[model samples]
Target chain A: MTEFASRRTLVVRRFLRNRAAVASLAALLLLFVSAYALPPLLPYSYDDLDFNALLQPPGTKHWLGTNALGQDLLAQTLRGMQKSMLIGVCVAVISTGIAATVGAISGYFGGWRDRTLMWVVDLLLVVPSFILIAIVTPRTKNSANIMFLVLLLAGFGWMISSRMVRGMTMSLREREFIRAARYMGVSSRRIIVGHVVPNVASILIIDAALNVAAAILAETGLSFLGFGIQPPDVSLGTLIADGTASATAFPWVFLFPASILVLILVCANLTGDGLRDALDPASRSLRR
Target chain B: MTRYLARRLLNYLVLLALASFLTYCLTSLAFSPLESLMQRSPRPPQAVIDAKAHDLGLDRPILARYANWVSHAVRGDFGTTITGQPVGTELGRRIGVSLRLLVVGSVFGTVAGVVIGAWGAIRQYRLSDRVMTTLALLVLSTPTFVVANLLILGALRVNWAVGIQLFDYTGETSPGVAGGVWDRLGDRLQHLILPSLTLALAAAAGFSRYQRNAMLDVLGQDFIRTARAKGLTRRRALLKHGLRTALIPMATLFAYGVAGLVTGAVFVEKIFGWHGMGEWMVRGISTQDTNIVAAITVFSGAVVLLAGLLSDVIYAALDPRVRVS
Candidate 1:
């Protein structure tokens, strides 16, 4: 308990010191704020058709220009960024929670529990998940389908991380402190919740960060194939897919959304790597 | 070794059977191919649909149809798409085209990653290393489609600025631009650049990150210290001792890396309008074309399982003390 206090200070200090990471954190905050908040301040709705101003480039009247259909590119893209950003962050958090719980249990408990969990992991590992998601996403048609999409991504995404967590837990279970806790009559579940899970926090943090990038990309792959977030609902994948054909003729419609995707992922990873380095003492000496 | 090889082949055979059976069962559950056919516009009459189902053996029990598929598949016929194109022929044709892209992407991505990664490690925190580190971080983080779309926009700007369309940003080739052999080859190469770059960049970035970490680990070992003390030149010592040793871990990862590389190429393929397995796969999944979907499932299962087994063999060979049971 006292130990976590000491490490938390050090982690925060080192985290603050990394210039790029700090910038990325700030950048991410601004990105989310603008993504969710910026839409209302603008007059253009994502789906609104401006037939008169079709295919205009960046200019005063249209900030990011209108597409071939006269839909405001900026408005459409900002909305798409919100979807991508929301999906990535939500999926990362949900997936990590699932991974930590599953992995810790599988690792701490041996016998049939481990075997059955590992069996499912191996089965999923063999499935080309992009196709699997594509198959699953197309059938569910609704306004709230994005929520279902996030859950679907989480289901497949957690396996790899859970396996990692399980490995960490397996080793942690035999450690001196964990054994001591057991000797002191702490319940298995309580000890696992308190000690075992928190001990693997560094990995869980890194996994969450990396999963943001993974989920975004996975969403992109699904969307490009016409399996996720269909028309009238602007997600990054759908926007990029829509923009792909006319990208050459009208760059504004495509460029901003693509760049937004790139920036969010790049920043997420940068901040994530920074956190990993700061939190893991060995990694600091190992790298810099 | 021979006994191990025999056992391995036996395991894969069982796995293949399971994979095919599961694919058929799940695909059938997803949608009825016969029903989809009947639902087609200008709907075929009930009798024609029934007759077609009977001919394709879809009227039989699921297991019986699977048995029928397996029997034909064993004879090198992979049944047919709903449109009556042979699955085996389309798969063969598409895999060949995709393999060309995937092969070059995988090989080049790995080699480039190793070289740059090692170089960055050797010059850690220097300008080149930091630049590459940042660039790789960016490249690896962004999705292929996003990267590709950015390139499309960039190329548009370039063409607009220069008033000449030098880059073939879309499709595999110019429409009807046949020429002499070398010229056609050059044209193909030109079209190949963007898609291949999209395919390879993330892979190379991922490889370099792993390779950098590995090289760093090797550089810390006592043997590397001893090599430096022996008065060999810095380059020679690093290459002979550090870099080669670092590659050991990479060797164990080759099968999975190549599998991953090829898998990722699906994104690049779709972006560039290439008619590869990825395109076939997207179509297969979307349309509920069981023949194509099942074929892809089995083929992908084989690739993944084959890679897993190959990695096992490599792991055994690399460290003989760790024998496969």
Candidate 2:
């Protein structure tokens, strides 16, 4: 009990010492909170089309200026942020959860299951994921379609994580503690969940953060191509695409949303980097 | 050496066989829908469609069609696009543009990444490391399209709003090709900056982190510690003992980067309107131009295979412990 507590304290200290990680967490918090608050606080609606005041430049009345349709750019941006953030977070969480669970299970159980699972992984790996998503997009419409797309993406995505976990588990299964657990007649599920899972937590967290960036990018690409999160539902990608048509005149409409997307991705990557460093003992020592 | 070469040749043959098999499967699936679509289109002449099918080898069995493609490919005859233009000619035209974009982008990116990474490693926990890492994080997290768009917007705003022309917002390159070698090189360099910078930014952060970690790892080794103990300056030890060992992994990364350059350049090309192989592949995929797609795929797969071979040979040369056999 004391050993576990001390280890926990050490991890906390290490995490706290990393200023970049803390700053990233703070930035993420501020982004999500502001996005949630911004839309309702704004006086104008996202879809309100003011024809007379089209393509207005940035000023007090229109903070980000009006678009070609004279819709409040600021309002549209804030709303778009909410939708994009939600999708990005949901996809990241759901995909990572699926990946980790399947990976852990497959890794713990060797033999035919691992072989079959790995074969499926190799099959998916060679196939172009972007093409699959593109082909599937035209077949479905609405939020359910978005969820289905995420599931398909996640289904193929788990292969990398599974391979990683299985490799880790191969070495880990021979460890003294695992042998001790087996001697003690501990259940396979308990041994895996209690011992193996905690050991690989750091890598999983790093992967999840990286996966968030990938999910956001994939979603943005699809949205930009006019397939993902279609009209009546807004995203930063859709906003950027819409702005692209009138970009020569109203560049801000595209610029703001795109910049925010970039910021989110960068923060996620930084967090992944910091976590990777903190988790790896060699890397942590190298920091000094 | 002869036995090793024979083994490698066999491996290559197997890889080629697998690739041809996949090409056949995917091409057939991809073409079937296109054929059905063409048939469904109003009043299409039977003879024209038949000619198109025959030309595509859609009239032949799958194995025969694949064999024909493999044989023609091996002979460097990339056949023709759907529009009946020679694939080799089309590919050759685009290769120059793609090479220019890739070489310039990768060189600048490598230099920037190495320098920044070294700086971060040297600084370690200092303010410089913190700041640089933050910037890198921002660059790493952002999607490529988003970053490109942001940079484009920044260029436009600077050019129009602030009355400063840092770069061309429309991403238009120079039309002139100089007669002299140096002058031609200068023209190419001038056309390179925007696309190169965009590509560099996307990779810069990851490269920096990798280089920094590798350097740090090498620095901690016993030889470096002994050198420091012998009263050699930290800089001297790092330069001699540290960097030599640290660069092995970086070389591997560079090899992969070179191989992926054409593949990765597509997004940058499309955004900037550059006529490159990346752009060609994108257009081919969108239009369902199977011949063009197959040609590019084969060409790129060959480039990647060659790069992998080169990297293995280079690795063996650099590290005495690496066994070539």
Candidate 3:
């Protein structure tokens, strides 16, 4: 138990020592705090129309300026950050969960189950999910719902990660610990849950972190295409899409949201990198 | 080896057919050509709408319609667009435009990426490596559209500063060019540079990360030490043995990167105003044109399929064991 505790501490310490990761994590926390905390304190809600300040540049009145619809950029941006963040995290978790489960099942139980799962993964991986999602979104009535979008994103996102997990699990199944667990007559379910999952948790955590960035970009792409996050619900994608036309004339509309997107992706990716270095024994960065 | 490749080819062909069928079914269910006709400004008569639907075979059942489309598509007849243009012919033109950009972007990106990544791996933990890592992460983080826009912005600023149109940031070529073949080609290249660079830079960032890791992994292997112990200079040992081994996984990555390139091409084309498959696809979706959407999906599927086959071939060439298998 103490050894296990020390191992956990070692990982935490390695992660902390990576300046880029620590800074990025701090930045992400700041973003989370401001996204939720500042909206209430702000004078205007994302929807509140300041008709008088329509298309105004950033100033004392509105920190990030107003869009053509006269909505406050500051409020809208924060609201967008909230939506993007929620979608990214939710989609990542859900997809990673699916990947872990599917991978563990297929990898632990070989034969037809493995073949079937792998076949499905190949099928999903081959077809471009972006075009399919775009086509499907307009048809579904509930497509506007964020949860529906989350499900769709998660559905397509897990295949590659699952394959990776399966590969890892394949190697792991032959190990002494796994074979011993099996020999002891531990239930397959128990072994997968208690043993296999914990062994593969490092890869899953890294995948989840990286997936946060991917999901955000995917959401942005969908929203930019007008298939995601309908009106009255803003995301960074929708904001950037709206601002593209006037990117030159009114640069603030485009600049602010785009920058926030960059920030979010950078932070998520750095955190992922840090986690990988901390977890992966072969990574050189972990060396003194 | 030949049998293996042939089998793989057959499998991909079957997959392509399956993919096409699914695309047709989904698009047919999702879109309504009749609605587009009904929403016409003059509101065409019901009889006319019905006649149009019948002509387009929308009146037929989904499976029957798919059979028709597949038969025609197999014969290289993708049918007519909703706007009454030949889908196959239009696709032919668009494929050329898209392929030109994609090829240049991916080739440039992969070459530059491999070089940079190898350099970084060789100088691991050095300032240069750190700089390259930071730059790559920055590029990877930024969205493609944002990158394309920023490129345009920078080009605009450059044009302004120079007080001459040094770079053409929009479209394939100027409205008209009165010059020799070389001059016309030059004009086209000027327009190509920005869009291709945008795609290439993004691709390079991703590939470099992969290559660097692969190179680092290979660098620490026993073979490198063995080669050095056999009297090869460090550089000679590393370059000949290390890079070749490092390049094996890159073959697989290159195949996967093609799909990513297709996705990036969509944004790059839209931003740069290039008349390519990417633009056609977006237009098709918004207009709910089933024929155009189906055609592009199949084309994309084929591109990915071809890429996978190419990767397998490259893999065999790199690792002789693969060929034996």
Candidate 4:
């Protein structure tokens, strides 16, 4: 009990000393809170049409101004933020989950299965990701279309995670503790879940955070091209695209959505970077 | 070295072949829907359209069409755009813009990243590092469009609110002296600041973080410890021993950064209304200009391949462990 408590205290102290990590955490929290909270405080709905005040510049009445459609830019921006966050989080979770399972199994088993899986991974890695995503996304339809797009993105994405996990596992599998656990009749599944997963969980978490940033960018790019989260459901990318024509005149319509997008991406990347350094065993010793 | 060069040359050939084939296949696939869409002309019947397709060599075997395209591409003829302009001319104009943006942005980003990273790493546990890291993170998370918008808004707003012109945020420009290389270059650089800075900031943040972490790792290694134990000055040890090893990982990152600059400058270019290859590619896809798209893809692919090769050579030079054989 004392050992566990001491370890927990050490970790807490180390975490506290990491200013980047703390800052990232704070930024993410603020973003999340604001995304959920801002919509209700707005005067008008995101879809509300106000043709008279079309393409209004930023002012007290509309902080972000109205778009050419006369929709409340603030409301649309808030809703867009929610959608972007959702897509990032969902894609990251799904990709990381698939990667962990496939990677762990292949690394532990290590034979024909590993070879075949790695071959597929290598094939996917060589092809430019944008091309692959573009090719696959156009063929699907509706909500399933979005889900399929996520899956395809996730499919190509897992290669990096798998490569990292396998490298880590190849050495960990040979540890004396693993041999002892096997001798003591520990099941393979239990050994993997109990012993291996915890060791690699940090890398997985960091990779997932990085994936969130990547997914957000990818979603934005596709949305800008009109292939993702079409009308009635505005993403940051969609909002920017919609406002693009009038961007020179009504800059706020593009500015707010674009700024929010950047904020989220930056936070995700920072969190990943901080986590990577903090969680690494070598760097941990350097921390306070 | 001779054998290694031969092997690499062979690999390049294969990559070129594969790229060409893939471009051909994807282009044809992209055009199939267009063919149907374009077939419904007001004056032409289905049979007449089919006949036109035959005359245009669209009805030829895929391999034959690919060969013809490759031959033409080799001779620097990328056929014509939908608007009947030479695809080569269009690509050259756009690629020239993108290259200008890329070179300026990359140079600034690399220098800024190296300086910031060194500063942050030196002050690793201090307030300066914290502040810089926080700022970098903020810049990194901000989308390209947002950064562009904010900068433009701030520039324009400041220009209006105060009668100072830090930057001309407008896209309009009078044609400069066409034949004067230095003058043209200067004009291009002046026009490039806002968009280039937007690209540079995001890239610099990532590069700085990597450099700091990598340097920190190298600083703790046994060689650095040994150098310190041998009574070498801390600065000397860090500069000579730590930095040499730390910069190895940055080779791969540098290659990736260059590739990203070329491909990812799309948004920055679009927001600023810069006539770059990114903008051209976006327009090509939107307008279904396959010839121009193909040309752009080939150019991008070639740049990426060359960058990859350069990265490999640099990595081999930096790390003795990377045996070429």
Top candidate, metric lDDT: 3
lDDT tens digits, residue span A157-276, model 1 = 786567556654664676788889999999989898878865666556656766776777676666666666666567776777677566657777777787787678678766765775
Candidate 4 runs further than 4 Å off? A1-82, A90-141, A155-210, A225-227, A240-274, A281-288, B32-52, B60-64, B67-97, B149-189, B192-195, B229-236, B271-276, B323-325
For model 4, how does the per-residue alpha-carbon lDDT over B1-325 read when each residue is reduced to its tens digit?
7885786566556666676577667766665423444656575577876765665576778778778888878888888765457888777787777776677778788778877886777676588987887777666554566668778877788778888665664442334436666866566666777877787887787668667765665555688888888999988888787887667656756765666456567787776777777777666666655576667667776666666567657766776654431
- Sorted by DockQ, highest first, which candidate order results? 3, 1, 4, 2
lDDT of 3 by residue, A1-288 (tens): 555565668789888999988999999988899999999999888899987888998988798899888999999999888877888888988999999999899878877797678667666765657666786655533325567778788998897567556655665676788889989999999899878886666557656766776777776677666776567567776787777667778999988987787677667767866876676556677667
- Identify the leading candidate in terms of TM-score: 3
DockQ of each: 0.20, 0.14, 0.24, 0.16
- TM-score per model (chain B): 0.87, 0.84, 0.90, 0.84
lDDT of each: 0.73, 0.67, 0.77, 0.68
Q: How far is candidate 3 from the true structure (C-alpha RMSD, Å)?
A: 4.3
Worst 10 residues of 1 chain B by lDDT: B316-325
Chain A TM-scores in order: 0.81, 0.80, 0.80, 0.76
Error of 1 at B291 (Å): 2.2
For model 1, the superposed segments whose C-alpha errors exceed 4 Å read A1-5, A93-118, A141-144, A158-210, A280-288, B1-13, B32-47, B71-77, B121-126, B137-195, B212-226, B232-253, B260-264, B267-275, B315-325
Best by DockQ: 3
Question: In candidate 4, which residue pairs clash?
Answer: A262-B141, A262-B142, A262-B143, A265-B141, A266-B141
